[PDB]
C-alpha cells in the first residue's frame, strides 16, 4: 500500500528537484536519479528527530497525516528490497552512504537499522585531509557501482562533519535491440535554435508506444527494456521545453499512462552517454531542509554525541544509450512496408527511466548536447 502512495509522491519530488535544477543551471544538460534522491533522505531521516527529520520528509512530498512516519520508514525499507532483488537481464542497485568525521560516533543500533532496513553503509572519515576523503567516497561509489560511477564527490570544504552520498547502478538490454548496421555516423542534433552538434543516429523500424500531447506540445516515445524498466523520450515541439518542464508532474505520467498507444515509427535514437554531478545542498535547503545542516541539528537517532550535522549531500548520475541498452556490448543476429510515421530525436530531448513494478523514477533528465 505504501510503496503505492510512494510512487505518486517521488514522481512528484522528481519533477520539483528537476526544475529546481533548470534554475541552477539554465540550459545545460540535466540528469540525476530521482528514487536513489529520494531513499536516501529517508535514510537520513530516519537518525533524525523532530523538525529535523518531518523537514526531510515534508521535502520529499509527504504529508505526515496520510503517511504516517513509521510507515514511510518501511515502505522505502519495501522499495530498496524490491529495486534491488536479484533479476535475470537486469542489474539494479540504489544505495547511499553516509561519511561521518571521525570524532563522532554513530549508535549502534542505527548503524545496524539502516544496513538492515536501506543496506547503508557509514564510515569514519578524517575530513582534515580533504584529498584522502574524497578518494575513500568515489572509492566506495565506483565499487558499489560496479565501476560505472567514478568521481561522484569533487568539493568537499574544510571542517565538513557529515557526507551523505547515493547512487544507482543500472545495466539492462532493450527489448527492442537496435540493428548496428542500421547507425549513422555524424548526424546533426540541435542543441540550440542555430548551433548544431554531430552525434551517431541509431535508427529501426519497429512498433512502439507514442503519442502527440496536444496540451503540452510534445511527442512521447516509450522504449522498453528487456525487464522492469523503461525509458521514455519527451520530444517538445520547438520553442516549447520550457512549457514541458514546467508541465511534468505525476498527473502528467497518469495522462500519458492511459493516453500512449502502439504502432509503428521509423524510429532514429541518438547513441550516446550522459552524466551529471550534484552537490544537492542549495537546492535541498531551498527546498525545506533547513535544520539538518544546521547547527541546530537534531540527529539523536544516529548518535549521542553533540555537533553533528548535514555538510554535504552529493550525487552523480551516469546512462548510455546504444544499440543493445545501457552496454556496449555485440547484439546477436537472432534478436534482430507501409509507410510509417517518423520519430527523429535530433533536438533536445527529456528522458526519464522508470520502474514497472514499483513505479519509480531511476533516471531523469534533460539532453540538452548528447556529446558532452
Ligand atoms: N503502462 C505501462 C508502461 C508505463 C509504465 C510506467 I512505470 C509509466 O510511468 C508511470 C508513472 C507513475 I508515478 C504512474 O502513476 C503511472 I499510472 C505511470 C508509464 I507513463 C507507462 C506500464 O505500467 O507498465
Ligand atoms: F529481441
Ligand atoms: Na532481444
Known amino acids: ?86 533479476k535475470k537481464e537486469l542489474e539494479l542497485q540504489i544505495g547511499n552512504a553516509l561519511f561521518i568525521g571521525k570524532h563522532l560516533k554513530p549508535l549502534a543500533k542505527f548503524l545496524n537499522d539502516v544496513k538492515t532496513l536501506y543496506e547503508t553503509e557509514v564510515f569514519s572519515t578524517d575530513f582534515s585531509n580533504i584529498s584522502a576523503a574524497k578518494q575513500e567516497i568515489n572509492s566506495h561509489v565506483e565499487m558499489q557501482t560496479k565501476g560505472k560511477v567514478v568521481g561522484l564527490i569533487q568539493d568537499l570544504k574544510p571542517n565538513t562533519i557529515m557526507v551523505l552520498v ?20 555524424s548526424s546533426s542534433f540541435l542543441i540550440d535554435k542555430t548551433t548544431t552538434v554531430q552525434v551517431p543516429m541509431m535508427h529501426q523500424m519497429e512498433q512502439y508506444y507514442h503519442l502527440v500531447d496536444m496540451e503540452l506540445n510534445c ?86 554525541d553533540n555537533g553533528l550535522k548535514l555538510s554535504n549531500a552529493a550525487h552523480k548520475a551516469v546512462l548510455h544509450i546504444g544499440e543493445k541498452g545501457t552496454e556496449a556490448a555485440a547484439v546477436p543476429e537472432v534478436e534482430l512496408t507501409f509507410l510509417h510515421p517518423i520519430i527523429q530525436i535530433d533536438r533536445s530531448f527529456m528522458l526519464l527511466i522508470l520502474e514497472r513494478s514499483t513505479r519509480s523514477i531511476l533516471f531523469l533528465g534533460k539532453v540538452v548536447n548528447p556529446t558532452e
Open 1 to 86: 500500500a505504501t510503496l503505492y502512495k510512494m510512487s505518486s509522491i517521488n514522481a512528484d519530488f522528481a519533477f520539483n528537484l528537476y526544475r529546481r535544477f533548470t534554475v541552477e543551471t539554465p540550459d545545460k544538460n540535466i540528469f540525476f536519479s530521482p528514487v536513489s534522491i529520494s531513499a536516501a533522505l529517508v535514510m537520513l531521516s530516519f537518525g533524525a528527530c523532530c523538525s529535523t527529520q518531518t523537514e526531510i520528509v515534508e521535502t520529499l512530498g509527504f504529508n505526515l497525516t496520510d503517511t504516517p512516519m513509521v510507515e514511510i520508514q518501511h515502505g522505502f525499507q519495501h522499495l530498496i528490497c524490491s529495486l534491488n532483488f536479484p
Open 219 to 304: 511527442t512521447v516515445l516509450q522504449m522498453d527494456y528487456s525487464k522492469n524498466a523503461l525509458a521514455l523520450f519527451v520530444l517538445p515541439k520547438e520553442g516549447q521545453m520550457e512549457s514541458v518542464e514546467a508541465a511534468m508532474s505525476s498527473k502528467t505520467l497518469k495522462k500519458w499512462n492511459r493516453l500512449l498507444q502502439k504502432g509503428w515509427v521509423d524510429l532514429f535514437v541518438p547513441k550516446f552517454s550522459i552524466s551529471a554531478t550534484y552537490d544537492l545542498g542549495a537546492t535541498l535547503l531551498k527546498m525545506g531542509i533547513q535544520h539538518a545542516y544546521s547547527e541546530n541539528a537534531d540527529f539523536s537517532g544516529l548518535t549521542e
Open 166 to 185: 547515493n547512487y544507482i547502478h543500472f545495466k539492462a538490454q532493450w527489448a527492442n535491440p537496435f540493428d548496428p548496421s542500421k547507425t549513422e555516423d
